[PDB]
Structure 1
């Protein structure tokens, strides 16, 4: 009841007691392990007033235990106050302090996030007074400008009104605030980002005038209080982009690649004391490999291993010439170098995974554990030459948390 996780590179052992506070379920049983199911039946998100208070109490007890005013009068009164409000209003409202705590700790608990060493340094923007898609557009624009900080990227989250009935729902329909468009071609192939081809088609179905190109930043599709979503284009001066060059291969610039500096996930759901925030875009900075390995070299994404290995002049006839590997490394050297030379914040997969081991040590010390999803923490290249490969990690689900949620167009009772 006090499990141990070993690092097999360093022979370090850490004792995990935090998993005992775990509440949610993982998907695994004693007879089957789902650790590699991407969106397990559990990881996806209507409530009742009865369910709501234990979740509120449980959350409030750890918040007051975090300011070391656990069980005091200030705590018991807040327990009573929210109990009463879940009677009166069948729900409740977080204090600003509670919102900032819960949001930080949802990140802290994000077992698939390798960046969490920064969890306490998160800027929380309270958009709970927002009422229109135009207001969402405004809060998001302030979020982009703030979190971008002229390339000195800063972690932030903007938290729109919580779900109430369900049919009134604030949603950012974009999967991220800044993403490149995907256009299928008349010959079947794909321009831009193939991930977003369906989303790009939705934006055009709502009137987007597509500049049918590669790195065309998509418009925000913002749904406010259940109403139909509306298009807004982020002021281009607010979307910071890094042109990708290589520090040796001067032909690399002719590849004509770029990426945006701000990774800002917008499709997920924040849970805080039973309250559900369906629109809560959050940003940090990139680990290089998300761009250089996944964005650029996934077969179903940009898929540039072909053209890079070409210009490198590589033994491409044979699978075993590791021409794909050799061109994957150059691509990631180039992403890193380009971002660093523009002073745009980026972390390489070695520095990031080291920070996470350090972060794990702190979490087992001053917290008793650190839920971690090996399948997601190990970078998608050079796995075993990074220290997280060698670190046993216990995955368990704690709250507050970020959850997945259905895409809004599969669930929105639309009315033209």
Structure 2
């Protein structure tokens, strides 16, 4: 029996048959669930992964068992036998990157998974060429505020050559300066890469919203520093529709969420550098980035300014300030004409995705704790949706920092 999956809002019941195809194992056992953990830490093995991926490709174009399907499998087997590896066709790379997104359990934005611009950077040969690829990516995906999902796939990992790596966790990140108190000026999430940027010659600023340079690693080559063209880096000043003092906080966020530090794995091949981007869900900026105590931690300042009773928890000042901070983010992005999605629309679109995927594949790997927004969780429909978390391939994977 496949796991019975219930929606408690409607009473509806599904069975996730797709989970039975999970390959790489997760961290849970019958003895103890570790779903809440942030991190769950060669010829023939490659071949079965490659074979399965090719089968996935030929299923997607409704040509399984075709002459071309058989021939591509034989073709991959021949290349793996001669070289120990193989090369994706362009069409398989596009398909692979979209499947990797489709398969990402913590992604609430996967309604969009079939609308992904795949930039093939596989013949990239230096950190300078990398930077040019990344600028094109940023330019295409920003699209002057009309954001478009993109992924740029740099060359796959191969024996006898180091990896392309982007040291930054996102293409656009604000600096975080370890101030000499032990405190931090800027984004505390980014003190480490801030430290490494300076160490590599970057003259640091002193604001709370200093865009970091990129540290780009070509294979067998220490990382190289590149400054983004400031006009490629679209940013949103934060104002509140009704709280006019909010603008005086001087809050900014950037338009493009572009994760650059995960590994893309497709049919056994690994792409350590394959930055990908979409558009923000506003709770990422409003609640996590600006209200996490270990981030910009502005919750109390806004609340004091709102004249809330911060002396007692029971006034719900924290919830009140946080809601208004999320309102400001959405208002400010809509005002700047920068794509943004609120957690209500995002989670409703995800409910549509689950329904599509149940039809399409008989299931959908989903990490409930990450799909539920960080505010107002049970006000969104995904709260009441039981979800099955499992690992499919192609996949985006966390990988160690390259230092």
User: TM-score normalized by structure 2?
Assistant: 0.99
* CA distances 1:25-66 after superposition (whole Å, capped 9, x unpaired): 11101111110010012xxxxxx1222111110110111111
Match of 1:414 in 2: none
C-alpha distance in structure 1 between counterparts of 2:202 and 2:14, whole Å: 52
Where does the alignment leave 5 or more consecutive residues of structure 2 unmatched? none
1:17-28 to 2 correspondence within 5 Å? 17-28=17-28
Match of 2:327 in 1: 333
Match of 1:239 in 2: 233
Cα deviation for residue 73 of structure 1 reads: 1.2
**Which range is displaced more, 74-83 or 97-106?**
74-83
Task: Determine if the alignment matches structure 1 residue 354 to structure 2 residue 348.
Answer: yes
Match of 1:365 in 2: 359
**Which range is displaced more, 169-178 or 21-30?**
21-30
Question: Where has structure 1 moved over 6 Å in runs of 4 or more?
Answer: none
C-alpha distance in structure 2 between counterparts of 1:226 and 1:339, whole Å: 41
C-alpha distance in structure 2 between counterparts of 1:379 and 1:304, whole Å: 19
Match of 1:72 in 2: 66
C-alpha distance in structure 2 between counterparts of 1:178 and 1:82, whole Å: 37
C-alpha distance in structure 1 between counterparts of 2:94 and 2:30, whole Å: 36
C-alpha distance in structure 1 between counterparts of 2:178 and 2:49, whole Å: 45
After superposition, the Cα gap between the structure-2 partners of 1:8 and 1:182, relative to the gap in structure 1 and judged at 3 Å, is same
**For the aligned residues, what is the CA RMSD?**
0.9
User: TM-score normalized by structure 1?
Assistant: 0.96
* CA distances 1:195-231 after superposition (whole Å, capped 9, x unpaired): 1111101010010100121101000000012311100
C-alpha distance in structure 2 between counterparts of 1:235 and 1:166, whole Å: 34
Cα deviation for residue 167 of structure 1 reads: 5.2
2:100 aligned residue (90, 101, 106): 106
1:145-184 to 2 correspondence within 5 Å? 145-165=139-159, 168-184=162-178
1:230 aligned residue (224, 229, 232): 224
Q: How many corresponding residue pairs? A: 403
* CA distances 1:93-152 after superposition (whole Å, capped 9, x unpaired): 000000000000000000100000000000000000001000000000000000001100
Task: Determine if the alignment matches structure 1 residue 143 to structure 2 residue 137.
Answer: yes
C-alpha distance in structure 2 between counterparts of 1:238 and 1:244, whole Å: 19
2:80 aligned residue (74, 86, 89): 86
Q: Secondary structure at the match of 1:136?
A: helix
Cα deviation for residue 389 of structure 1 reads: 0.5
C-alpha distance in structure 2 between counterparts of 1:16 and 1:204, whole Å: 48
Match of 1:310 in 2: 304
C-alpha distance in structure 2 between counterparts of 1:269 and 1:364, whole Å: 27
C-alpha distance in structure 2 between counterparts of 1:80 and 1:89, whole Å: 14
**Which range is displaced more, 119-128 or 181-190?**
181-190
**Which range is displaced more, 135-144 or 62-71?**
62-71
C-alpha distance in structure 2 between counterparts of 1:112 and 1:333, whole Å: 24
C-alpha distance in structure 1 between counterparts of 2:169 and 2:161, whole Å: 20
C-alpha distance in structure 2 between counterparts of 1:171 and 1:165, whole Å: 15
C-alpha distance in structure 2 between counterparts of 1:395 and 1:226, whole Å: 37
C-alpha distance in structure 2 between counterparts of 1:23 and 1:166, whole Å: 28
Match of 2:53 in 1: 59
Q: Secondary structure at the match of 2:382?
A: coil
1:290-309 to 2 correspondence within 5 Å? 290-309=284-303
Cα deviation for residue 166 of structure 1 reads: 6.9
1:278-297 to 2 correspondence within 5 Å? 278-297=272-291
